[PDB]
Design a protein around this ligand. Structure first.
Ligand code: ACO
Ligand code: OAA
Ligand code: OAA
Ligand code: OAA
Lengths: 157, 273, 273, 184
């Protein structure tokens, strides 16, 4: 069941990895589009503990929680339907398989170019089996003006 | 000038929540210093506002002051006070002498507070009865820390364990962990009569009991300040009083620089390298 | 065994007079710990027993607690709290973080207490009127330390200078040195409106006033503890509360290791050596 | 007087083996200070005598001096040098400023030396190949410490890693653990 609405003004996302420049550009795009809520709910990084990262919401300082595992980030944020995987070319496949075990995710954008084609075919097969839309790999992302931006598409403001 | 007009953003580091030096008057947690003095809270009140950011009740602040005054000094032959007297006797100032005494406070000297608190907290939270807990500590090959005094055993109580224990009995609302530690010492005094709760163990278990038994703590924060080491801050802040007193005493008696005797060394150097 | 029978003498060093760890119970000056708790003396009472070896009166002990709580913290942007936050943020324990913050306390940071106390004591003991004293300080080329605030000037008082000043006015028996410092600030506010007594100056002059105005001090001991540095112990013991709070706050917010920006250095290295 | 005649025993604590201040001249391990200066050993020689109580060979002492000089400073923006500059700028003496800077050295600042040494020692002593070791560190969720630089990557070497590495290659007799770390 691939939905025809991927992103809206209620769309939240989980960014996989230390990409605070991309998350800051995400929050800048959300602020300039007169959106009430930030679209980054949590950040997942297995190489550090659970803490908070200090970002900008326009003029204001806000805190985005960075989680070690994916399960606590999925439990604490049930409104997330988008995961943006900023993992490398060798750690994107297992992270995407771990993402697709959660039914709340409706789309995954895989940013990393490089992945072998057989693992990408396995990702495509499980995406057709689960209905999750995979934007990528080897992409910069996708932009919906007024609603949501993926990663580094467009650039800065 | 360009931040006055608000056309730039600089990422501001150094996040803090314990003091507001700017503005009109000093704000510790969310309340001004004049409201601190008007409500007549003690030094335990400003430890509540500065360390925990919460207005602790009057019995909790008075107990924090009470556990500070018993921790104040325990003689000069302890290791940190020895460091304080040595550094003060070598012509140093108050900061260096107190500092060199405070740096001795670690796991062996003054470490019974936080480790005894964590030991009894892990015993009580895991649902183990004291009879099984004592056997588990015995057969793991490590002693129950916070329990065991050298000389004062049975109908000869520590007399500052007694005052703190009495204040916790009439003034605290509910004491599960203190009663657990009382059962553990009732077992270990049946083993050997001088295995009573130390002041280092009773302050620890009553401090965990205070954090998880009184109001305003949400049962992860009461277990978080133990892990961070708020028990160590109580010991170091209490013993700083006695260390500054040791500095003032060794400077007032006007004693010259100490050198250890050579008959108390017993050099074991190798023959030739 | 040969000292039990008393047939040898060993010269005993390490003279002390602030604690008696042996015997039955803890004795601070000459009184046991149960008499400390039964007489209901505060933390200022055990600073009186440990630092000065004297039972200070109730207003003096309450004033010592009062001057401890205003000294507790003054924000993170001060230099010692910056050292505490830096050392705590680099993964160190409480002792190292508090210690590295306390070692900043010297002549520039926190040195206004003891030096302001000595300055006003040498002004008052030498029989110089405040009008001549201000001119003497002006024409010697150094500022009156303990006097001068950045923002809060006239009908906008420091609001913790006010509480301490009020408590000294109703509760102290006689205040010569405080009135002398009031005349000095009445001159210097006629010069520039923000030249009021700081808390660092008022605690100093009121502490000297307390030692030389209340009982049990014999007028060389009241001038001796100022020279030794008992004012510095008040500041360091007070600010240790805020420094331990800073350690617990920077460990609870879970902030990673700090590195200074390279645009806030301005390297001026030579061209080639 | 009663210990001069030897009719009493006092239990002597404070056991030490790194210096002999008594007697004629200073003895570090078992050798006098004049033999230290006559054999022309460097500062690495007295770290060998004082820390390890052994006369290290000349390449080992020169390598100890070499690893001291690259460790000497890495700018003021590091956390300990920031503490040193803050404490020195507040009117303190050398001991307090150096001390407040040294107390920053812990697990996060300067902890990569001992923890990286223990990590590669536990990797090499347990018989794990580097290809399995990197995957084991990746799937345990913690980074290989001692590995990873911010800017200087490939054909742009650290230029003090290179000098130490070259000195270890020509002067050390056998390098199993260095070759293991090179494979990692
Ligand atoms: C014109 C245009 O611009 S169009 C752009 C369109 N094309 C693209 O988007 C493709 C570009 N690709 C990318 O940008 C990258 O692939 C990105 C975004 C995923 C970034 O990935 P990278 O930064 O390479 O990987 P990452 O930072 O996770 O680190 C790589 C490895 O280093 C490992 N690592 C990091 N630190 C350490 C350490 N100290 N010790 C050991 N290993 C370490 C990481 O764990 C990771 O391991 P893994 O690869 O097994 O996970
Ligand atoms: O606190 C400690 O563990 C050591 C101490 O003061 C004592 O001798 O009782
Ligand atoms: O006493 C000092 O000089 C430091 C201080 O707290 C302040 O800035 O007021
Ligand atoms: O030794 C450390 O871990 C920190 C350091 O000097 C660096 O910035 O390289």
């Amino acid at each position: 069941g691939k939905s025809t609405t991927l992103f809206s003004r209620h769309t939240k996302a989980i960014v996989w990895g230390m990409q605070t420049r991309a998350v800051q550009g995400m929050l800048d795009f959300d602020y300039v589009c007169s959106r009430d809520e930030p679209s980054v709910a949590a950040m997942v990084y297995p190489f550090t503990g659970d803490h908070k990262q200090k970002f900008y919401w326009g003029h204001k300082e806000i805190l985005i929680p960075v989680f070690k595992n994916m399960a606590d980030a999925m439990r604490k944020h049930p409104e997330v339907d988008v995961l943006i995987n900023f993992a490398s070319l060798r750690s994107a496949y297992d992270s995407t398989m771990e993402t697709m075990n959660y039914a709340q995710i409706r789309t995954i954008a895989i940013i990393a170019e490089g992945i072998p084609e057989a693992l990408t075919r396995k990702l495509i097969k499980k995406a057709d089996q689960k209905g999750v839309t995979i934007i990528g790999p080897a992409t910069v992302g996708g932009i919906k003006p007024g609603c949501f931006k993926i990663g580094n598409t467009g650039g800065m403001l | 000038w360009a931040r006055e007009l608000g056309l730039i953003r600089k990422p501001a580091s150094f996040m803090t929540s314990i003091c507001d030096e700017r503005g009109q008057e000093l704000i510790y947690a969310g309340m001004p210093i004049t409201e601190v003095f008007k409500e007549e809270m003690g030094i335990g009140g400003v430890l509540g506002l500065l360390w925990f950011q919460k207005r602790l009740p009057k019995y909790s602040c008075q107990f924090i002051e009470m556990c500070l005054m018993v921790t104040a000094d325990h003689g000069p032959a302890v290791s940190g006070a020895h460091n304080t007297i040595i550094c003060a006797r070598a012509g140093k100032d108050l900061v260096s002498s107190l500092t060199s005494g405070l740096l001795t406070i670690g796991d062996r000297f003054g470490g019974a507070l936080d480790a005894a608190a964590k030991m009894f907290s892990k015993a009580f939270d895991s649902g183990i009865i004291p009879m099984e807990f004592v056997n588990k500590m015995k057969k793991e090959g490590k002693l129950i820390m916070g329990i065991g005094h050298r000389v004062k055993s049975i109908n000869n109580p520590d007399m500052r364990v007694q005052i703190l224990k009495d204040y916790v009995r009439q003034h605290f609302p509910a004491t599960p962990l203190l009663d657990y530690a009382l059962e553990v010492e009732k077992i270990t005094t049946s083993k050997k009569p001088n295995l009573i709760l130390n002041v280092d163990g009773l302050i620890g278990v009553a401090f965990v009991d205070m954090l998880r038994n009184c109001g305003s703590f949400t049962r992860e924060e009461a277990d978080e300040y133990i892990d961070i080491g708020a028990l160590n801050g109580i010991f170091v802040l209490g013993r700083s009083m006695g260390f500054i007193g040791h500095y003032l005493d060794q400077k007032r008696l006007k004693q010259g620089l100490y050198r250890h005797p050579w008959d108390d060394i017993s050099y074991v150097l190798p023959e030739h390298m």
